[PDB]
Every structure is written in structure tokens, then in C-alpha cells.
Structure 1
Amino acid sequence: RSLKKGPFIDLHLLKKVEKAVESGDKKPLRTWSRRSTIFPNMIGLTIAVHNGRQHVPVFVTDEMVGHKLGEFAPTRTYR
């Protein structure tokens, strides 16, 4: 996989997470950034990733870190 110069997250999602974590647990964050990675601080949040037509809630666990947000949001439905 790519990118050795800092794991990448969109400015907006970084600031939205930092604001969400410091306040406390609340609700699913409407975010479209699938490209963004998952930090350690994102654990506990049930952020809602855009599959394409709707937002899929994803409870972030200890394992979901190095992976990107789009991996937990299947786009193409089948059967």
C-alpha cells in the first residue's frame, strides 16, 4: 500500500473527530471521506461512511486502524 509521509485523513474529518472525541460520544458522523485512514483516537465512534446512495454506520474497533473507511462500506450490492 501507498503513502509513507504520514497516514492521510481529510482536514474536515480530523477536526470533526477531534471535536467529537473531546466533547464525548454522541451520534453517527455523516462523512463522505472514504479515502481517509482511521486513527487510534477514532476508536469508539460510530461514524457513518457514504457507500454511494446512503450512509453505513461503522463502530470503530481496535483492529480498524491502518485500514481506510471505504473498506467498511460495500458499494456494489449483490444477491
Structure 2
Amino acid sequence: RSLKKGPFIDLHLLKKVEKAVESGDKKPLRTWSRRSTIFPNMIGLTIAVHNGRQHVPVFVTDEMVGHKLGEFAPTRTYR
């Protein structure tokens, strides 16, 4: 929520969508700076995350708009 008066990005990430958004049927993209907020032009693909024990795939189906990319990464065994 501290994204305090409007949107931002990962600056290096969207710079690098640019061939894997060229006919979205393709293999995934990857990111390590999990803070990672993202444009609605990504809709149609797979984007995986450094959790960071391993690298877990998150999925840009039909709705993406509302939270940073951390919301599905399992960082250590939650007892």
C-alpha cells in the first residue's frame, strides 16, 4: 500500500518484455527484484519469480491490475 500517490514499475523488467509479448504463446519471462509492479500490456503470458529458494511461475491470464508480484512467492517453510 505504501506506493503512496500512484503507480511505479520495475524499470528493467518492462524494458525486456518486448519480444515475449510479440505473440504471447511463447515460453516464460523471469525476475529477481520481486518488488516488481507491471503494465496491463503484459496480458496473455507467464512471468516467474525468484522466491528466492527457487524460481516459481506467476500467470497473466485475464485480470492483471492490482498488486505487486510477491503475492505468490513462498520465501521459507511457513510452519
Alignment TM-score, normalising by the size of structure 1? 0.76
Q: Is contact 1:49–1:56 with CA below 8 Å preserved after alignment? A: yes
Q: Distance in 1 between matches of 2:76 and 2:64?
A: 21
In terms of fraction of residues, the more helix-rich structure is 1
Give yes or no for contact 2:37–2:68 (8 Å, CA) kept in 1: yes
After superposition, the C-alpha distances for 1:18-76 in whole angstroms (9 at most, x for unaligned) are 33213543212121121011321122211111101211011123333211111121212
Q: Is the 8 A contact 1:37 1:67 kept in 2?
A: yes
**Aligned sequence identity (%):** 100
Is the CA contact 1:33–1:69 (under 8 Å) kept in the aligned structure 2?
A: no
Structure 1 runs (4+) deviating above 6 angstroms are none
* Ranges in structure 2 where 5+ consecutive residues have no aligned partner: none
Task: Compute the RMSD of aligned alpha carbons.
Answer: 2.1
Question: Taking structure 2 as the reference length, what is the TM-score of the superposition?
Answer: 0.76
Kindly indicate whether the alpha-carbon contact (under 8 Å) linking 2:32 and 2:49 is maintained by their aligned counterparts in 1: yes
Equivalent-residue separation in structure 1 for 2:5 and 2:23 (angstroms): 30
Cα displacement string for residues 5-28 of structure 1 (whole angstroms, at most 9, x for unaligned residues): 542212211111233213543212
C-alpha contact 2:10 2:38 (8 A) present in aligned 1: no
Query: For structure 1, which runs of at least 5 residues remain unmatched after alignment?
Result: none
Q: Secondary structure at the match of 1:71?
A: helix
Number of residue pairs the alignment of both structures matches? 79
